[PDB]
């Protein structure tokens, strides 16, 4: 039975799942949930996922409500024995650790910045505060990449897919000029065919945020 | 060599690891990092974990910087064939999904509330706003418990360990009186021998928060 993905492509964690789906050529039914219209509070969706969040995957009787679980599940099912979710324990733990960095640190900070803009309007956000928090994330990722060309090791893993969608979102606002390894990695990611799955949603998010927040991102910032 | 855990027992994600260490009889070397003194920014610790967070586990050459990775790693190395981290794919994914709920939703919201107290003082926190956000988490967990005695199924898993430490922390402020499944589950968790590993740190957090936030929890 084909997996069903409830999605809003503006969302970075949704885009990571879209990227994996494209990378592994997985047949998935897409069901759109417009977050800015509050459709995630529809009684049926709420009953499916009380966290009212996307992505949400329905695959048979399995209901997953977090991009990182979805990434791992899809890797184990459509890339069984593969290197995206490595077979060797230490390597798999490294990937898991970076998936969790994306959730706990990078996404948390980007979400709190972007959500502030949605709630308060850009002109009323302490942008310098968020610049510091997100620059700190850039410095961390630069440190990770000083040892390897991918986030969790020498090969592409789920961690790269998870991190690149949020990094691309942070970089709508904050430039990467001071971060040579991060620039190299991001450019490499942009060369993947799977990266196309990031584009529509990133641009939609850009346009949506500028509308709701009443501002423009500096065009010079985004690496393209 | 044996695992080294950098820890501050006030931290909910530290306490889940302490619970697992007790549950599985794991021999670990503990190293205290006092977050309220900013010791997580000490040069050597920062070099080890640029996220300046606890728990951090060093196990040989493996450095883990997230409690959920630590729980999974320790279960895989020290509890092969156990039920805490089920080997059947669907069951494992359910546990993983709940671990990620704890990280992404429950802990995020509790951390935001508690940090607001630290930074603003309790008297200056929008408590109603946080009560709404955290009560929402209670509601969600009440739902998760509808078909089973534990968070991820009929048996105790890593998910319960991760969730109970944060839930016990939210419960410093907000009672479980309206949530019968959740209150039943929390009472059951408190009966586990391993839950003793949560006690010291929870109380230390209560005391630290009340001092730093210039207030007293209702539960105090
Ligand atoms: C403005 C912005 C960027 C704020 C956001 O946080 C997002 S992402 C959409 C959000 N999804 C999650 O929070 C899932 C995070 C999990 N850790 C994961 O799946 O990895 C969401 O569904 N929000 C809806 C809601 O909370 O009501 C965004 O898209 C907009
Ligand atoms: C005031 C309070 C409750 C705020 C907190 O957030 C904590 S928990 C300590 C914190 N640890 C993490 O943020 C790890 C979260 C990961 N997702 C995980 O391991 O599961 C921490 O180290 N903070 C220090 C810092 O950020 O500088 C707490 O203890 C105090």
UniProtKB/Swiss-Prot annotation, chain B:
Zinc found in the keyword field: no
Catalytic activity from the UniProt record: RX + glutathione = an S-substituted glutathione + a halide anion + H(+)
Role, per record: Conjugation of reduced glutathione to a wide number of exogenous and endogenous hydrophobic electrophiles. Essential for ecdysteroid biosynthesis. May be involved in detoxification.
Expression sites by tissue: Expressed in the adult ovary (at protein level).
Protein name: Glutathione S-transferase E14
InterPro entries xrefs: Glutathione-S-Trfase_C-like (IPR010987), Glutathione-S-Trfase_C_sf (IPR036282), Glutathione_S-Trfase_N (IPR004045), GST_C (IPR004046), Thioredoxin-like_sf (IPR036249)
Ranges where the GST C-terminal domain occurs: 88-215
EC number: 2.5.1.18
Organism: Drosophila melanogaster (Fruit fly)
Disruption phenotype: Embryonic lethal. Embryos display severe developmental defects such as poorly differentiated cuticle, failure of head involution, abnormal gut looping, and defective mouth hooks and dorsal closure. Trichromes are absent. Embryos have a higher sterol content. Embryonic lethality, defective epidermal differentiation and trichome development can be rescued by supplementing embryos with 20-hydroxyecdysone (20E), ecdysone or cholesterol. RNAi-mediated knockdown results in larval lethality at the second instar stage, which can be rescued by supplementing larvae with 20E, ecdysone or cholesterol.
Enzyme class: transferase
Domain (GST N-terminal) ranges: 1-82
Protein family membership: Belongs to the GST superfamily. Epsilon family.
Alphabetized UniProt keyword annotations: Detoxification, Lipid biosynthesis, Lipid metabolism, Steroid biosynthesis, Transferase
More about this protein: Member of the Halloween gene group.
Molecular function GO labels: glutathione transferase activity; steroid Delta-isomerase activity
């Amino acid at each position: 039975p084909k997996p069903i993905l409830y999605y809003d492509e503006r969302s970075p964690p949704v885009r990571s799942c879209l990227m994996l789906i494209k990378l592994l050529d997985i047949d998935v039914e897409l069901r759109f949930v417009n977050l800015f219209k509050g459709e995630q509070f529809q009684k049926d969706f709420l009953a499916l996922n009380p966290q009212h969040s996307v992505p949400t995957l329905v695959h048979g009787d399995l209901v997953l409500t977090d991009s990182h679980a979805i990434l791992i599940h899809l890797a184990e099912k459509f890339d069984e024995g593969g290197s995206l979710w490595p077979q060797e324990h230490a390597e798999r733990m490294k990937v898991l650790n970076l998936l969790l960095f994306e959730c706990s640190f990078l996404f948390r900070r980007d979400s709190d910045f972007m959500s502030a803009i949605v709630r308060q309007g850009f002109a009323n956000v302490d942008v310098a505060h968020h610049e510091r928090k997100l620059t700190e994330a850039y410095i961390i990722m630069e440190r990770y990449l000083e040892n390897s060309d991918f986030m969790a090791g020498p090969q592409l893993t789920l961690a790269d897919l998870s991190i690149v969608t949020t990094l691309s979102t942070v970089n709508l606002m904050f430039p990467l000029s001071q971060f040579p390894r991060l620039r190299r990695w991001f450019t490499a990611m942009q060369q993947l065919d799977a990266y196309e799955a990031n584009c529509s949603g990133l641009e939609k998010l850009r346009q949506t945020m500028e509308s709701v927040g009443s501002f423009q991102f500096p065009s010079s910032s985004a690496v393209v």
